[PDB]
Design a binder for this molecule. Sequence first.
Ligand SMILES: *P(=O)(O)OC[C@H]1O[C@@H](n2cnc3c(N)ncnc32)[C@H](O)[C@@H]1O
Ligand SMILES: *P(=O)(O)OC[C@H]1O[C@@H](n2cnc3c(N)ncnc32)[C@H](O)[C@@H]1O
Ligand SMILES: *P(=O)(O)OC[C@H]1O[C@@H](n2cnc3c(N)ncnc32)[C@H](O)[C@@H]1O
Ligand SMILES: *P(=O)(O)OC[C@H]1O[C@@H](n2cnc3c(N)ncnc32)[C@H](O)[C@@H]1O
Ligand SMILES: [Mg+2]
Ligand SMILES: [Mg+2]
Lengths: 131, 131, 134, 130
Amino acid sequence: VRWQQRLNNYARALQQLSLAVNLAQTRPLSDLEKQGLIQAFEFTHELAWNVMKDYFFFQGNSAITGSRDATRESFNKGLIKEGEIWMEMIKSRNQTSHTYNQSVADEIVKNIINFYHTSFQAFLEKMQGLK
Amino acid sequence: VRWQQRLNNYARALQQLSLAVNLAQTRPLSDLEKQGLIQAFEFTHELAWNVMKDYFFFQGNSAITGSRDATRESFNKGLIKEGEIWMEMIKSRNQTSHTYNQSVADEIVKNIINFYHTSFQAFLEKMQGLK
Amino acid sequence: VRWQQRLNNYARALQQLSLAVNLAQTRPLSDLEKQGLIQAFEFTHELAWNVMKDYFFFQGNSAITGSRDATRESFNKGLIKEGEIWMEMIKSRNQTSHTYNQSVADEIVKNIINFYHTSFQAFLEKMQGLKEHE
Amino acid sequence: RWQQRLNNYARALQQLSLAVNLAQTRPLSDLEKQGLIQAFEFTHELAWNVMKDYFFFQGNSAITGSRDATRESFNKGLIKEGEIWMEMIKSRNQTSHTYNQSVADEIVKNIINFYHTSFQAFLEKMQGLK
Ligand SMILES: *P(=O)(O)OC[C@H]1O[C@@H](n2cnc3c(N)ncnc32)[C@H](O)[C@@H]1O
Ligand SMILES: *P(=O)(O)OC[C@H]1O[C@@H](n2cnc3c(N)ncnc32)[C@H](O)[C@@H]1O
Ligand SMILES: *P(=O)(O)OC[C@H]1O[C@@H](n2cnc3c(N)ncnc32)[C@H](O)[C@@H]1O
Ligand SMILES: *P(=O)(O)OC[C@H]1O[C@@H](n2cnc3c(N)ncnc32)[C@H](O)[C@@H]1O
Ligand SMILES: [Mg+2]
Ligand SMILES: [Mg+2]
């Protein structure tokens, strides 16, 4: 029940992230649109690890508390394949207060486009199949 | 001095937020640009309350635990005038994981444009006068 | 065999749970003893579904992500008979943080004594048999 | 609201306190030792959720789980004994193994000798904060 509602909101959020990633593949993003892509990454990643946590609670695991726990357990049980990429997302979340520096904003944007988006899509497909 | 270094970065972040606020006064923002305005609010507010915390720490106050404490102390010591607006900023910060919903995003955007931008400008002028 | 080694630990855990259940059939438990019965249910259920997961992995099924997956597969394959009871166990596990409320503690304790203990014992017998025959 | 979470924390801690007091007066049975561990687990779960709720009230919505909450509470002075609060998380992670008498005895020892006092200090600190 609760995990499937979270999954639906995750899909909605990721759809907005995907639109921004597809726009970035068409033309360069403005500095303001880059900040918007980073915000879409923040709300998509937040939903994603909460889908993990909710799913494991549905499975009867109430030991997961945070995003690192949820990510580790997802890798251990095969919900994700790229454990290191998902751990890197947590590091990127911890940098978003520094994106008023163009170099930080560019580096997060590159990781979102080059790695995080496809990982989000794979996780969505995996959880939809479990649902 | 740390709080003055923090203030210089606050000024750079506020300059970026102001570009986006001034753009929003002249035409509708796209959905992605709205999220970027929210991200610029996030990094500008995070710098602003850390200026407050650093400044009061430099004056010998070590009891500030977070942005609400910093805001309360700034109101009591005259660093801000619009106490309720700065408290509303904290409520906005705590909603940013929900900005994939249009109702939420448009509410934060409206507050940034109508109230927070000028409150940030007033704080910049106050702190520069202390520097 | 890994699932058989897990089974031995499950049997040891269940022996401790049974001591407490049989004490609870004899006199009322104190509030603290009720918390202990809940903790023994938690370590016994944890072993039980890991026996399930281990067994199904040995059989060729590696798609089990946690106790609900394990319980569904055990019910489908006949390792357990009372599917609703084992699913209620998962709801009780997920109530663990709330047992400082006396009504929650009393509810889980009632379920452990009236339903879960029997199911744990039947599963032990079933898996012991699978060491020797199908 | 963090203050309602704090009220529940105080209620849970009162139960743990009565169990620790009991253990100071006589040996606990094996079943009572498992109960003491369970009461530690629901008290610790409330404690780090107080920490998370409090920092959310302060405007920090980045804290996710118990390690984050404990680290931020230490950094901001809500707790002083960071090592003990980090040991509590280690003990929580051992919960499935307390049917081994040596595991249970070790957690019980830490609850009585260290965790109870730290829980009390944290209650006092948070009460002072509102
Ligand atoms: P925030 O505290 O995230 O950033 C402050 C640090 O970034 C350095 N920095 C980067 N880019 C600049 C420019 N253009 N001007 C001044 N400082 C900059 C600061 O030196 C801090 O280390
Ligand atoms: P996130 O977990 O913040 O959102 C989940 C809940 O948001 C509500 N919701 C769904 N669809 C919308 C739209 N279009 N606008 C505003 N809010 C929405 C539902 O209650 C979700 O469960
Ligand atoms: P304590 O466990 O009372 O913490 C208060 C919050 O937990 C929720 N709550 C109490 N009891 C339960 C059960 N049995 N299941 C799920 N959630 C529970 C309250 O609603 C408070 O939010
Ligand atoms: P039971 O859960 O004891 O399973 C038997 C095996 O689990 C390992 N084990 C026992 N106790 C612990 C703790 N405290 N932490 C991690 N692993 C544990 C041993 O390998 C047992 O033989
Ligand atoms: Mg953001
Ligand atoms: Mg327990």
